Design a protein around this ligand. Structure first.
Ligand SMILES: *[C@@H]1O[C@H](CO)[C@@H](O)[C@H](O)[C@H]1NC(C)=O
Ligand SMILES: *[C@@H]1O[C@H](CO)[C@@H](O)[C@H](O)[C@H]1NC(C)=O
Ligand SMILES: *[C@@H]1O[C@H](CO)[C@@H](O)[C@H](O)[C@H]1NC(C)=O
Ligand SMILES: *[C@@H]1O[C@H](CO)[C@@H](O)[C@H](O)[C@H]1NC(C)=O
Length: 1368
């Protein structure tokens, strides 16, 4: 529980990015100088502490543990205002360090920017909420920076690691007890162009050094190393960190490559190998083009005192030599098997010398080939290896095993093989086998033609497969001499690390079909090593390289799946109740991430079924899909950019019920139960007799016309039932992008709105009838949805038959992820060979409605112990990128049983916020009619192409409806539909996000990969206005900044109408009755004429006399305490009513929240004299409130009191009402003592007291008296309210009071306006029972409060109350 005090200061240096701290006087530098960074100091800023050899620009690590309050003294020294902003802490408004309009007072604006040469102090209390849980690494790593100017401060330096660990796991010096060494790395992309001194620069660095020249990291042998990898970049950049020859453990997954996104952080294991020096690099092709490397040195330390654990079995069982002969060979290859060319390339040329059309494409690749004999004299290997194209033979390696690799280069250029993630185990030590590795342990002889040599690979007990992992892991292998132009060449491979023990080089399990190799390789022929002979010699053109391309650099590059273009890959085939093993890998020099989608089928990923998978460059990912829905489907890439879109693999799914036939085609197999071992000609007949799914469906009968009830009949074969009917339609409306931030709310970059921000686009709108004649108005729950369509929700095992009617000018359809469905209910129109009866769902014509029947099942539900609900999405699928853009998109939520109300399907457990972090390229949208356009000067001038309106739900700034209470669990359904090379790192200011499930991981920010629908849980920390934003600077500066509001926990306070705060003139009504004035209606109790009534109730509608309450200030109101008024055996009360709210007196909105009607009809009060309390489920913010009765007993008559809290601040009783403020805290000078009155003691002044109420009194009745409030700590006091005392056959109260406040209790600093040193006179009260509320223009941030009754009517009396919250 120790307090950790750190000292930092942002100071200027002269950095050169070169490895040298001091090597020579003269400097030859890549263009950058004079940056600013902050470094740690000794206490009281004596002199700078020595910096580590590794951390050049990386700041000091501010280590801490939960329960430790850390104070950072920030004495700025650079010549620019700056600040420090954390990332994963429940920091307050005084230590946030971020400058936006939070409507906070000037006392709390000092943290946003400190002037140079002026000090401050940052306090970040760490609690159990923002700390590591079980199943979580001991130390969580975050990054803190300067929030004054995120674009300019980062690029000029100003970065620091931030570790928050568990309890008792941190030493005095900040080192974990269990880990021998901890190393902090910063893969940052510094840009000196957007810096203090603009010099053209794009250097790619680790820590503060460029070109992989950071000094080597020296570690001992077989050591436990904990890594803290940070990645930051001003623009969207992706880091794919790879530890060559090593394996790490990240989030209970043993992986060789760690993937990071800009402005993120990660921690992981590492167990070091015996000897030798390795290298770590980045697998991103543009990152590998530059250096971005670090060298890790492993030296056998004699003084290490190695335990010699020797944890190994070394017993003959479960191991075999498994010799593999993979001698590479130079071949000719056809990227497009246009003519039926099968079984690889035994026959070589058959060439027409034309790149297009028939064979003769002549893309001369060097692929790996498998042999069987020592001398390689005969090929000797020819498995049925069709549809496995340019791929090295697959190596299946068990745990504990070893294997042998032999090459014989039959090409001209020397080549090699690099086991990527295959020498993951500590590579066997060598003395001469290094083969001039270049001091990197990289075994590359670069085998010459007619040369042969052998590699040794192995594995220890600790292995990449883990308990929470797939059966077999995927890891590729390639060459090292030139990565780009050999990946562009045929030197490609893929091998598996199978945890399953029973493989024996025959097969893993002959019950799961193995469609092992599906590799999206992008071979760039313009980068091919054999370009000169290929391109020129075999065309009707002269001899020029011609790499400047009108088309060539785009025409020659071909995206293929296993070396075959998807336009000529024959359809696949798997039968019913079959498991299929898929091993994907993105290896082509695309530099862009790739996502894939299974139509009608879902994976198993961890313990989730994801239905969509994202691929990173040179990282292997393996999933297993089980066939469940009959018919034909496909795999497709959802990136769907005009570059590299057509990547589709069509696979069938048939009931393979005729098991009597023995002849099963060997590969591409319908697998029998018994395990025997101890293009064209694929998806055709002689496959086990496959029943035509289009004429033998049991789910759908095609003899008669399609009926949704008939289809849902077979779906509802169980007791679940629960049909959920949704009537939805597509309508074209004029949409606002910036109308909420035109002149108010958050800052705007679209100054003066050069365009109207009123683009026309089509959206989803829900209806209640099948006639589509009446609309269902959007309530307050969904007012944050914006452009998103209605929330379609259902339970598990349910069937959702949805009726969709097109009301636009173009055909639109409806396609839903995750949920199971027939081909008769789908939105995608591909070549599925379907009849015309399955093609009526593909496109829905205007003025026509089609009913879709989806069946929620076990695959579409959340985990067993995980989050309650999980999110999918539905969108028009006639043309996706033209349909998700233009506004056709919506959320689809599925939850476990017993969570949604039957009549209205809304979960009552937790609030749900659906946010679609996507940007809308309006050029892609339809209705993009350009008139008098092209007036823009640059290609990035106007927001039609320069800015894609980076928005959260269609609104660039200040998305409304984001309201939640503090200390409240809310469920966040973060979505990202399709997209392309755009990963959003979602950051909530002052909040930490928990990833629920079977592991319970806690994060500060979440990188949102495209196509991922991640559901999280968040607990609000403190009230106020906090900023929701993506953490990338350049996308945040121009959008994605929604200030969301966190309300007080106790927002149930009388907003007036009973105490007397609301003036008599602030209340009006539509009609009268005679002496039943609207003035009397506000009072909750008392009075002979005590309420408001009218003559009679209307008939056609409410059309009822309303009553309006004025506030002169927007406040949060949560409920209303309505009651009747009975008098002389006559009773009257409002039985039913609805409430309308508005900020001004023009735009009136009727309240409807969680109600199965057009508007809410509150249940009213059954009998008079009984206070009935109602609650508004989302609290409403407004200034005027109109409540109008709809039904009542006899003549309507109403008394009303409003409950709520003040907005944009802490307005809660700090005490003085409940027992929170002890009697021993507060006191005063002198009390009146009388025998009959006993003691008129202090500490009895409380907001409401009765009997012998003791408000306050004085035994002298003079000017110098006061009442003192002694809070335990420094608190923020906002408002004070006074109410005098009881009549007591007299009339005693105060007229005017003056305030002095102090912290130590001796200073007594008066509170006054900036006029002069005279106490400000505060308004008193006239009523004996009335409450008069006084606000503070600056809030008194102090401990002690003195209030002095300067002006008094009689013996001084006072029953005060205080409001506010704790500071930290
Ligand atoms: C790190 O590795 C050890 C053993 O390999 C494992 O027990 C632990 O759970 C891993 N994760 C940590 C320490 O966060
Ligand atoms: C060194 O780094 C620069 C960027 O700062 C990069 O352009 C250059 O290619 C690197 N050097 C080599 C040999 O790749
Ligand atoms: C659809 O019907 C409406 C009549 O309600 C008609 O005005 C419209 O022209 C028709 N066609 C389209 C494409 O909306
Ligand atoms: C929401 O409405 C349902 C019925 O419409 C009701 O049972 C439930 O109590 C409501 N929830 C809240 C928080 O008012």
């Amino acid at each position: 529980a120790q307090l950790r005090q750190f000292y930092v200061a942002a100071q200027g240096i002269s950095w050169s990015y070169r490895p040298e701290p001091t090597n020579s006087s003269l400097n030859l530098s890549v263009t950058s100088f004079k940056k600013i960074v902050y470094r740690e100091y000794e206490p009281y800023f004596k002199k700078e502490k020595p910096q580590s050899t590794i951390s050049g620009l990386l700041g000091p690590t501010l280590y801490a543990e939960v329960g430790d309050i850390i104070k950072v003294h920030f004495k700025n020294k650079a010549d620019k205002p700056l600040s420090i902003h954390p990332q994963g802490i429940r920091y307050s408004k005084l230590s946030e360090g971020a400058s936006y309009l939070d409507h906070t007072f000037p006392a709390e604006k000092m943290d946003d920017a400190v002037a140079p040469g002026r000090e401050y102090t940052y306090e970040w209390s760490i609690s159990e909420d923002s700390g590591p849980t079980h199943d979580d690494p001991p130390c969580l790593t975050h990054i803190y920076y300067s929030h004054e100017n995120l674009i300019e401060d980062f690029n000029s330096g100003l970065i620091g690691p931030l570790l928050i660990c568990k309890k008792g796991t941190l030493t005095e010096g900040g080192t974990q007890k269990t880990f021998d060494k901890q190393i902090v790395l910063l893969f940052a992309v510094f840009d000196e162009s957007k810096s203090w001194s603009q010099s053209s620069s794009l250097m790619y660095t680790v820590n503060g050094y460029v070109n992989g020249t950071m000094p080597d990291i020296t570690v001992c042998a077989h050591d436990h190393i904990s890594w803290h990898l940070l990645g930051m970049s001003s623009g969207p950049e992706l880091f794919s960190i790879h530890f060559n020859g090593q394996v790490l453990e990240q989030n209970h997954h043993k992986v060789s490559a760690i993937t990071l996104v800009s402005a993120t952080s990660t921690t992981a294991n590492m167990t070091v190998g015996p000897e030798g020096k390795w290298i770590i690099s980045s697998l991103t092709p543009k990152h590998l083009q530059a250096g971005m490397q670090a060298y890790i040195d492993i030296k056998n330390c004699p003084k290490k005192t190695r335990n010699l654990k020797k944890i190994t079995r070394e017993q003959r069982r479960h191991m075999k030599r498994w010799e593999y002969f993979i001698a590479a060979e130079e071949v000719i290859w056809d990227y497009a098997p246009v003519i039926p060319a099968n079984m690889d390339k035994k026959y070589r040329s058959q060439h027409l010398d034309n790149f297009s059309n028939q064979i003769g494409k002549h893309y001369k690749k060097v692929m790996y080939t498998q042999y069987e004999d020592e001398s390689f004299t005969k090929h000797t290997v020819n498995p049925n290896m069709k549809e496995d194209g340019i791929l090295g033979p697959i190596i299946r390696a068990q745990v504990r095993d070893t294997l042998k690799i032999v090459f014989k280069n039959m090409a001209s250029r020397p080549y090699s093989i690099y086991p990527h993630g295959v020498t993951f185990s500590p590579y066997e030590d060598e003395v001469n086998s290094s083969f001039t590795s270049g001091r990197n342990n990289t075994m590359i002889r670069a085998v010459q033609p007619g040369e042969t040599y052998t590699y040794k690979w192995n594995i220890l007990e600790f292995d990449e497969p883990t308990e929470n992992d797939a059966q077999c892991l995927t890891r590729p292998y390639y060459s090292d001499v030139d990565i780009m132009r050999d990946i562009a060449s045929g030197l490609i491979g893929l091998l598996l690390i199978c945890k399953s023990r029973s493989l024996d080089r025959r097969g893993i399990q002959r019950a799961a079909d193995i469609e092992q190799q599906a590799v999206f390789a992008v071979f760039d022929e313009n980068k091919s090593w054999y370009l000169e002979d290929n391109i020129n010699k075999f065309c009707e053109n002269p001899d020029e390289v011609k790499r400047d391309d009108p088309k060539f650099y785009e025409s020659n590059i071909m995206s293929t799946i296993n070396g075959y273009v998807p336009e000529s890959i024959t359809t696949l085939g798997f039968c019913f109740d079959d498991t299929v093993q898929w091993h994907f890998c993105s290896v082509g020099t695309q530099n862009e991430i790739l996502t894939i989608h299974f139509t009608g089928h879902s994976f198993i990923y961890g313990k989730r079924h994801e239905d969509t998978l994202t691929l990173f460059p040179m990282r292997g990912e393996s999933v297993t899909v089980t066939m469940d829905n009959v018919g034909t489907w496909m795999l497709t890439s959802m990136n769907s950019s005009p570059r590299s879109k057509k990547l589709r693999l069509k696979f069938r799914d048939v009931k393979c019920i005729p098991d009597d036939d023995e002849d099963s085609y060997e590969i591409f197999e319908p697998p029998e139960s018994t395990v025997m071992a101890t293009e064209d000609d694929y998806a055709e007949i002689d496959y086990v007799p496959y029943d035509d799914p289009y004429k033998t469906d049991v789910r759908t009968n095609i003899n008669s016309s399609r009926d949704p009830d008939n289809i849902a009949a077979w779906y509802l074969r169980s007791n679940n039932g629960n049909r959920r009917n949704y009537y939805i339609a597509a309508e074209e409306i004029s949409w606002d992008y910036s109308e909420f931030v035109q002149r108010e709310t958050d800052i705007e970059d679209s100054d003066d709105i050069p365009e109207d921000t009123t683009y026309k686009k089509v959206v989803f709108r829900k209806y209640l009838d099948s006639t589509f004649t009446k609309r269902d108005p959007r309530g307050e729950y969904e007012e944050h949805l914006g452009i998103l369509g209605p929330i379609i929700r259902a339970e598990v095992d349910d069937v959702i038959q949805v009726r969709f009617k097109n009301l636009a000018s173009r055909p639109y359809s409806l396609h839903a992820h995750g949920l199971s469905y027939e081909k008769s209910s789908e939105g995608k129109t591909y070549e599925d060979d379907s009849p015309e009866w399955f093609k009526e769902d593909n496109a829905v014509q205007p003025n026509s409605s089609y009913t879709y029947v989806w069946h929620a099942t076990e695959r579409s539900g959340p985990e067993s112990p995980g989050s309650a609900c999980r999110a999918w999405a539905y969108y028009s699928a006639v043309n996706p990128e033209k349909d998700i853009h233009s506004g056709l998109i919506g959320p689809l939520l599925i939850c476990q049983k017993g969570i949604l109300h039957k009549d209205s399907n809304m979960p009552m457990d937790m609030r749900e916020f659906v946010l679609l972090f996507m940007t809308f390229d309006e050029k892609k949208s339809w209705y993009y009619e350009k008139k008098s356009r092209s007036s823009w000067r640059l290609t990035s001038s106007e927001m039609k192409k320069s800015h894609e309106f980076h928005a959260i739900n269609g609104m660039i700034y200040s998305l409304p409806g984001l309201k939640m209470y503090e200390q409240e669990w809310v469920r966040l359904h973060l979505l990202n539909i399709g997209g392309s090379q755009d990963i959003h790192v979602v950051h909530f200011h002052g909040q930490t996000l928990l990833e629920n499930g079977n592991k319970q991981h806690q994060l500060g920010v979440w990188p949102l990969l495209p196509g991922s629908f991640k559901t999280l849980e968040m607990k609000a920390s403190k009230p106020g206005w906090w900023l929701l934003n993506t953490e990338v600077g350049e996308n945040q500066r121009a959008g994605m900044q929604t200030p969301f509001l966190i309300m007080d926990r106790d927002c149930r306070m009388p907003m007036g109408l009973s105490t007397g705060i609301i003036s008599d003139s602030q209340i009006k009504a539509s009609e009268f009755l005679g002496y039943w004035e609207p003035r009397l209606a506000r009072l909750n109790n008392g009075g002979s004429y005590n309420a408001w009534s009218v003559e009679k109730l209307a008939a056609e509608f409410a059309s009822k006399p309303w009553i309006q309450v004025d506030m002169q200030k927007e406040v949060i109101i949560t409920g209303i305490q309505t009651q009747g008024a009975k008098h002389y055996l006559k009773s009257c009360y409002t039985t039913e009513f609805y409430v309308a709210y508005s900020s001004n007196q023009i735009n009136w909105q009727i309240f409807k929240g969680n109600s199965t009607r057009n508007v809410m009809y509150f249940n009213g009060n059954s009998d008079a004299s009984t206070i009935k309390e109602n609650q508004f489920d989302p609290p409403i913010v407004a200034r005027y409130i109109r409540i109008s009765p709809t039904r009542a007993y006899n003549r309507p008559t109403l008394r009303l009191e409003l409950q709520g809290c003040e907005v944009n601040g802490c307005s809660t009783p700090l005490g003085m009402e409940n027992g929170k403020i002890e009697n021993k805290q507060i006191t005063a000078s002198s009390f009146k003592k009388s025998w009959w009155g006993d003691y008129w003691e202090p500490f009895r002044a409380r907001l409401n007291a009765q009997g012998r109420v003791n408000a306050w009194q004085a035994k002298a009745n003079n000017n110098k008296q006061w009442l003192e409030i002694d809070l335990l700590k420094i608190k923020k006091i906002t408002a004070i309210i006074t109410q005098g005392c009881k009549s007591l056959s007299s009339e005693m109260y105060v007229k005017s009071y003056t305030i002095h406040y102090s912290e130590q209790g001796v200073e007594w600093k008066p509170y006054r306006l900036k006029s002069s040193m005279v106490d400000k006179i505060f308004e008193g009260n006239t009523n004996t029972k009335g409450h008069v509320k006084n606000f503070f223009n600056p809030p008194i941030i102090s401990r002690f409060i003195r209030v002095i009754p300067k002006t008094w009517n009689q013996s001084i009396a006072l029953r005060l109350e205080l409001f506010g919250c704790d500071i930290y």
